[PDB]
């Protein structure tokens, strides 16, 4: 009798698909066919931050637009000064298998996590001179893929146990758990008002979660393979996903469907990271072919290329004030472009 | 670096740089190995001087003034394709197989095939242990090597059946630059840290001789 519920579910999916097709009256490309294309973009390496001894798996800018964290597999967590290339801190990690890092928006804390299934929070403004681990959030049954701060006291983490969770730091307990994915969640991104967030999992799907309740509002399926990266459009009414099938895509929360597709024939490797620009007219994307192609986020035409790395580009982040672009990679070097 | 505070901050930066360098040269003389194999195969008791120390379970036994770190990635229960590139730069891949189980044999064989022809481990050598040989040689007389491998044609005794299983495991190599060092631990009268030491010595010598052009 379960086939009755299955038929009702498939009827609901069919009605959803037909509603999506009914709301699709035009195309972003056909509309923006009239604007003028951005000329060739030539960003050049301004800084080179060296000092890691192994692959770099994550980085994150601070809100002040000058300092950034790097998490690496040699067990270190360095805090840089990107203007001067000084190292502000160097934090030794309890377990060298780290796959993510986050800088608090206030600048006081720094998170980290990886194969040990724990997200540990570090206190930078200690009364002593050292950086001490302030807490260890252990409630996940799979490696952590991403972690993002909301306050000094709320962090949201996504793990490869097919769940996302919202933590109360000073307490240590999962306030909410966002379940509903069927594959390993590989990335998350917070809305520019920190009330919603999207997650992209290995089941080739993205979802739109609500922080205060804990429900899933929308579900976007456009890819054929894993989703390794996700970003939110600056005004928070769209987001772009990158995947292992060499294809980025632009979804929009209001039309509840896909806007356009950024691919090419000479690109066969998967996207590792994506990020927008200060205004949303460019879309950067790190690839496994060691490059980083800048895209025209409204024409789907490749504008420039940041080819300066000798190994896969792991991480990628545009500065909060829009000035620079930092790209870490598996060859142990970060680079500040602009 | 003109201001007084800027000069002091640069001095702190240089101190951090030199501590990073010292930790790097100190952690470059460790030998990293990856323990694999199906569960219930002996991947937890190969080198009984093991000193263990859920995610990755490191283990740090030492032998002949050399530090061996062993990572057991079992019990992770995720998509291995997503976190296996963390161990893309280990020295070798230790693999344990329980010769006494005829049920876990094809699971172990497919897992060997998967980890042997991975794209990150296309030139990482394997140290295949065939654990629990004594029970195999005791029970082979009762349960022949035909309920597991129907293609068997040799004289059904211990030595030739074991050679056939070892050959069927090595038949999945399909790649140069990768040698599969076999051995048969018995778990009661064998001490096989010297086996890992010799295999790792040979692997590192081959890496070095392939860095000087020789192929």
């Amino acid at each position: 009798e379960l086939d009755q519920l299955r038929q009702e579910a498939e009827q609901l999916k069919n009605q959803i698909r037909d509603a999506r097709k009914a709301c699709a009256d035009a195309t972003l490309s056909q509309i923006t066919n009239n604007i003028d294309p951005v000329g060739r973009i030539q960003m050049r390496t301004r800084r080179t931050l060296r000092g890691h001894l192994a692959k770099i798996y994550a980085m994150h800018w601070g809100t002040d637009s000058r300092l950034l964290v790097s998490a690496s597999q040699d067990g270190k967590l360095i805090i840089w000064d990107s203007y001067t290339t000084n190292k502000v801190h160097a934090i030794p990690l309890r377990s060298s298998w780290v796959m993510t890092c986050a800088y608090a928006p206030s600048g006081n804390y720094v998170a980290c996590g990886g194969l040990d299934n724990i997200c540990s929070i570090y206190n930078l403004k200690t009364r002593e001179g050292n950086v001490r681990v302030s807490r260890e959030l252990a409630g996940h049954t799979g490696y952590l893929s991403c972690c993002r701060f909301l306050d000094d006291n709320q962090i949201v983490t996504s793990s490869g146990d097919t769940t996302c969770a919202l933590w109360d730091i000073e307490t240590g307990q999962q306030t909410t758990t966002f379940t509903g994915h069927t594959g390993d969640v590989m990335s998350l991104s917070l809305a520019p008002d920190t009330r919603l967030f999207v997650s992209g999992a290995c089941d080739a799907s993205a979802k739109l979660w609500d922080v205060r309740e804990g429900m899933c509002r929308q579900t976007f399926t456009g890819h054929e393979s894993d989703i390794n990266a996700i970003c939110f459009f600056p005004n928070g009414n769209a987001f772009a996903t990158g995947s292992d099938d060499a294809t980025c895509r632009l979804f929009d929360l209001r039309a509840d469907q896909e806007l356009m597709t950024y691919s090419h024939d000479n690109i066969i490797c998967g996207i590792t990271s994506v990020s927008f620009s200060k205004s949303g007219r460019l879309l950067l994307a790190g690839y496994d072919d060691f490059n980083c192609n800048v895209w025209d986020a409204l024409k789907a035409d490749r504008a420039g290329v940041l080819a300066g790395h000798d190994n896969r580009v792991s991480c990628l982040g545009v500065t909060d004030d829009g000035m620079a672009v930092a790209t870490g990679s598996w060859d142990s070097f970060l680079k500040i472009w602009n | 670096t003109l201001s007084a505070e800027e000069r002091a901050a640069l001095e702190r930066s240089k101190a951090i740089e030199k501590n990073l360098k010292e930790d790097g040269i100190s952690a470059a003389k460790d030998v990293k190995l990856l323990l694999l194999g199906a569960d219930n195969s002996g991947k937890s008791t190969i080198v009984k001087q093991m000193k263990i120390i859920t995610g990755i379970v490191e283990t740090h036994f030492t032998f002949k003034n050399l530090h061996f770190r062993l990572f057991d990635v079992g019990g992770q229960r995720s998509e291995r394709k997503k976190w296996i590139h963390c161990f893309e730069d280990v020295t070798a891949i230790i693999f344990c197989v329980d010769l006494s189980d005829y049920n876990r044999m094809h699971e172990s064989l497919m897992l060997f095939d998967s980890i042997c022809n991975n794209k990150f481990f296309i030139d990482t050598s394997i140290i295949l242990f065939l654990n629990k040989k004594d029970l195999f040689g005791e029970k082979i007389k009762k349960s022949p090597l035909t309920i597991c491998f129907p293609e068997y044609t040799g004289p059904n005794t211990y030595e030739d059946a074991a050679a056939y299983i070892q050959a069927q495991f090595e038949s999945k190599n399909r790649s140069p630059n990768k040698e599969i060092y076999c051995h048969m631990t018995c778990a009661t009268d064998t001490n096989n840290a010297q086996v890992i030491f010799d295999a790792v010595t040979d692997i590192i010598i081959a890496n070095n001789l392939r860095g000087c052009g020789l192929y």
Partner: single-chain antibody
Framework: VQLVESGGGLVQPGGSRKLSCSAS????????MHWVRQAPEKGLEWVAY????????YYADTVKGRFTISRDDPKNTLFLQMTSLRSEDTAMYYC??????????????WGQGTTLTVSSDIVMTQATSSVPVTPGESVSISCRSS???????????LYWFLQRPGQSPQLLIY???NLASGVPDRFSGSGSGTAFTLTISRLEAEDVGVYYC?????????FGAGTKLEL
């Protein structure tokens, strides 16, 4: 965080004495360290500085060659060996910790003081000398420099200190606008290069003391004359 100094007492001129500060409760090996003396009824005065790792050392030009600063890190102790004392060294010596990175708060914790009796430079100018105040009115204090403290990188190196009667002086404001951790929001630092101000809005008790303005643009550091508050 704690710092206690030892080595006080009387000396005859020409003699020698070693002060020692024993630090406990922080990562002593990562802080720079100063010595700041204060004559019987005068203002503060910088004496010596030793880096973290003892890499770089500076001395005031009045104690150059006579004094020698050094630190022992495994024992968490800072030494000042004084040679050829004079009648002008009869002052109370403080020990100050200081850590330097982007965004730090140097001069944040001061020791307790060990009285010792013995039988060009930027010139800060605390124009006034005493201000009679009553609890409730907003009060401002004015400092002035001989050289533009605004460096080219954008920072203006001016620090404000408050010494309550019979206690160590504590940091209020660093780099002329940032409030120190643990200081009420009543205080506010303003001004431009060569002209600074500290406005104690919504005054209260516990704010009766002496306010010194220190520069940190280049060594040797020079404090100010010291403006006093009273009731």
């Amino acid at each position: 965080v704690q710092l206690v100094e030892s080595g006080g007492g009387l000396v005859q001129p020409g003699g020698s004495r070693k002060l020692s500060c024993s630090a406990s409760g922080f990562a002593f090996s990562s802080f720079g360290m100063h010595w700041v003396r204060q004559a019987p009824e005068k203002g503060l005065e910088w004496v010596a500085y030793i880096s973290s790792g003892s890499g770089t050392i500076y001395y005031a030009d009045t104690v150059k060659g006579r004094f020698t600063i050094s630190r022992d890190d495994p024992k968490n102790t800072l030494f000042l060996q004084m040679t050829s004392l004079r009648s002008e060294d009869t002052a109370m010596y403080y020990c100050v910790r200081s850590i330097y990175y982007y965004g730090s708060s140097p001069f944040d914790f001061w020791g307790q003081g060990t009285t010792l009796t013995v039988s060009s430079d930027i010139v800060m100018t605390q124009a006034t000398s005493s201000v009679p105040v009553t609890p409730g009115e907003s009060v401002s204090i004015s400092c002035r420099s001989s050289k533009s403290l605004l460096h080219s990188n954008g920072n203006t190196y001016l620090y404000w200190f408050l010494q309550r009667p019979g206690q160590s002086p504590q940091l209020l404001i660093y780099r002329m606008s940032n409030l120190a951790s643990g200081v009420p929001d009543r205080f506010s630092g303003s001004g431009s290069g060569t002209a600074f101000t500290l406005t104690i809005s919504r005054l209260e008790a516990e704010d009766v003391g002496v306010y010194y303005c220190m520069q940190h643009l280049e060594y040797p550091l020079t404090f100010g004359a010291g403006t006093k508050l009273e009731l």
